[PDB]
């Protein structure tokens, strides 16, 4: 259903449907629709419109799905109204053939979380940290409305939603439906060399790492500007670019189109038997119909 | 075949012998499908149905090809049974012909490594040098962004 | 993010408030003051971007 | 055709995509940081932008 938005599943369907009920008002006060349904001898007076109200419906639904009715509009205005309904057609199932192709080449994978504030409103995905961390500390001794939010589902659950290391918080981010929060860079490394995890959102606190020295000393004066040294000559930099990246995992190329299962189209098997199932009912209603009838 | 997986094929035949099977229920059931074949002769008791058992596998089978056939469903539940099968051919046609242009867009967008640079980012395909030659010695001494990954 | 540069509270060679700064400016970080401070400036009118 | 090729297209999110298309026009301070970034940087996507 998706390369059709909803808008066009419903005004397709609307006009299914109106197209139907001009060809039921054009039929009728249209003389030449009006012809000798007895053919085989010459001048019986009689007339028929075989273009009724039900198989008006027939007409459009059996252009709709490229087959035609046996109807096949017969003076000049229910053929004109049959052949730009016809184009109608083609319009739309050239189009929904080629916008179906376009997902089954081009996919836009995206993620059902964008940021924290995704994360304030889906129960479904649960939060997680490190037991007693300096990212659990951030968000209980914070103020921000978010996080008050965030903080007070990870406060009152445990055991479920509070790991003990980030490492087993790996795995459960690997394992179950679990959002993990834990340090910036940690991630990276994490994310570099285990190409199904990511990095979704942005950071939330913004700290630092910094060389210890004891209370007092020189060598935090000569090493602050031998940090900037290394920095602003870009060496700092490409040690970072050594030390994290790994393997890489170029998937952004686009592999074979992984032939379409039952995950995939799925609904259709669904929709058939949804059709089975109701023109029973409607074999045993309209027979209940006729024996009233002949009653 | 390529474009679908053989349970859908395997699905797509039997639903072939499932709606034409349930059809032929509503044809002889519903009573607006008896119909008279001689409007040319207004007479009684030779009212008949065209859905035979096997009529009505040949309207599966004749929609499936989106060709349609020469049956055209009277009844109002015969002519639902019609419609959601069409709706039914439709998807499957264009999920045909959208995957198998996928797997030819695919194909003919791809290509062979035909630089070091295309080799330098897939890690599948696994490198080689002369262990102490010239060749690695170069590629210590490489200055080029290209190269020392290929190094590294 | 292509570079990482830092504006700091500029004091002269050797003076005894670049410490007390540095303990100041980290007290305001731990109770998220700056963050307000960032989002009572930075942020401005609706401006539509939702979109 | 058109549906395969607009879905497929992107733009540019990174400096390595505003690297190699000349179409996009860069630009700098005069004598500013950034442009003294470009001059001391060792990095292949930048001298090219430096270039
Ligand atoms: C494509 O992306 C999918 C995201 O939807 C991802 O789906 C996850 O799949 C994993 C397993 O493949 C699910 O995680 C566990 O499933 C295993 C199955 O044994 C269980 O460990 C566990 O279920 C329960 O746990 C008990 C032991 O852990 C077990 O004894 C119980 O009987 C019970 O099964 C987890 O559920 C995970 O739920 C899926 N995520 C979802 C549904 O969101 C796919 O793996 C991924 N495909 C690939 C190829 O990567
Ligand atoms: C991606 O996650 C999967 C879990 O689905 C990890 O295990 C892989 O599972 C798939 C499906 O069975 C198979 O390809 C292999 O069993 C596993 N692939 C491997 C070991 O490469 C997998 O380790 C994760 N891969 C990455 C790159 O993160
Ligand atoms: O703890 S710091 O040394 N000083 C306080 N912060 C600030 C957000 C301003 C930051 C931000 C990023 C850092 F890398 C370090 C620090
Ligand atoms: O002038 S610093 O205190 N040290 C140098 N850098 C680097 C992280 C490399 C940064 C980066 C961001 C800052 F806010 C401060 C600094
Ligand atoms: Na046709």
Not at 27 to 41: G, I, L, T
Not at 78 to 102: E, M, Q
Request: net charge negative; aromatic share 12%.
């Amino acid at each position: 259903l998706n390369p059709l938005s909803p808008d066009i599943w419903m005004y397709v369907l609307l006009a299914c449907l109106g197209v139907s009920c001009v060809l039921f008002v054009i039929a009728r006060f249209s003389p030449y629709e009006w012809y000798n349904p007895h053919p085989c001898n010459p001048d019986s007076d009689v007339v028929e419109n075989n273009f009724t109200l039900l198989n008006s419906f027939w007409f459009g639904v059996g252009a709709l799905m490229q087959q035609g009715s046996e109807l096949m509009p017969k003076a000049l205005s229910t053929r004109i109204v049959g052949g730009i309904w016809w184009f109608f057609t083609l319009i739309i199932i050239s189009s929904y053939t080629a916008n179906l192709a376009a997902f089954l080449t081009v996919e836009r994978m995206e993620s059902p979380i964008d940021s924290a504030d995704d994360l304030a409103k889906q129960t479904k995905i649960e939060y997680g940290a490190v037991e007693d961390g300096a990212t659990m500390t951030f968000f209980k001794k914070s103020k921000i409305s978010t996080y008050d939010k965030m903080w007070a589902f990870m406060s009152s659950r445990r055991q479920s939603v509070l790991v003990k290391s980030n490492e087993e918080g790996i795995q459960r981010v690997l394992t179950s439906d679990y959002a993990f929060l834990m340090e910036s860079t940690t991630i990276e490394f994490v994310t570099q060399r285990n190409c199904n995890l990511t990095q979704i959102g942005g950071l939330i606190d913004s700290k630092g790492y910094g060389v210890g020295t004891p209370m007092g000393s020189p060598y935090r004066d000569k090493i602050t500007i031998a940090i900037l040294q290394l920095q602003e000559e870009g060496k700092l930099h490409m040690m970072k670019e050594k030390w994290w990246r790994g393997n890489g995992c170029p998937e952004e190329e686009s592999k074979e189109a992984s032939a379409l299962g039952v995950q995939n189209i799925g609904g259709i098997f669904i929709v058939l038997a949804a059709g089975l199932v109701l023109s029973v009912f409607v074999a045993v209603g309209e027979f209940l119909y006729k024996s009233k009838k002949n009653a």
